[PDB]
Amino acid sequence: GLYEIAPVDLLDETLKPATDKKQLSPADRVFGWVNQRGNGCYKGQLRIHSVTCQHDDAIDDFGNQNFSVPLAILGQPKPEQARFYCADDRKGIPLEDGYDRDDGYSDSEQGLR
């Protein structure tokens, strides 16, 4: 089944990615922004540069280059898990325990976590 509301519609319009040159929020001004929907862009006020490692032997080769360690299961996120990703209010309140799934993306006064 489908939850009755698409997640984008639970997010406040002021929190959505910026859509005009006037509504640029602080991070958008500091780091810069590009409109994903039309004209509009701004070069960030910040540059990171001159990265160096200070040490020399910084790489943990475990002992021989043919070794390689296997590493968990980095599964894809699955926001269908409403009791994890949905918020009971647009302030990000966690959902109540015990209710069915349907309670999830269910009211516009719901929010996202």
Binding site: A27, D28, L112
Partner: protein, 114 residues
């Protein structure tokens, strides 16, 4: 503990001052009331840091292996973009800015009945 949580993004209606939305300060000159310059920052790792170079990855039975990315002096090379995205997302949190990267999310999600 579940290995992820969320910081709550508060709706920013009626946020004023500098935390609110504003026309940008711009690049054309250094403003008398605003600051510019160079900050020196030292990063040191606490848990090990993965920096896989996908350009050097290797495949067996479609299982994938990655070496650590290294720079022209043979030291581990840390992409400044990867520093940037770290800091930006932390900055977006503590400033509670607009969320800079939002994908489709425009169709209803599916679930199953019990």
């Amino acid at each position: 503990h579940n290995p992820y949580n969320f910081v709550p993004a508060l709706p920013r209606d009626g946020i004023t001052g500098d935390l609110g939305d504003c026309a940008p300060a711009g690049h054309s000159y250094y403003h008398g009331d605003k600051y510019s310059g160079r900050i020196a920052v030292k990063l040191t790792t606490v848990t090990p840091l993965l920096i896989p170079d996908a350009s050097k990855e290797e495949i067996n039975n479609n299982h994938k292996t990655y070496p650590v990315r290294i720079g022209k002096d043979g030291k581990p090379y840390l992409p400044p973009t990867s520093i940037k995205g770290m800091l930006r997302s932390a900055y977006e949190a503590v400033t509670n800015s607009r969320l800079a990267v939002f994908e489709d999310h425009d169709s209803r999600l599916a679930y199953r009945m019990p």
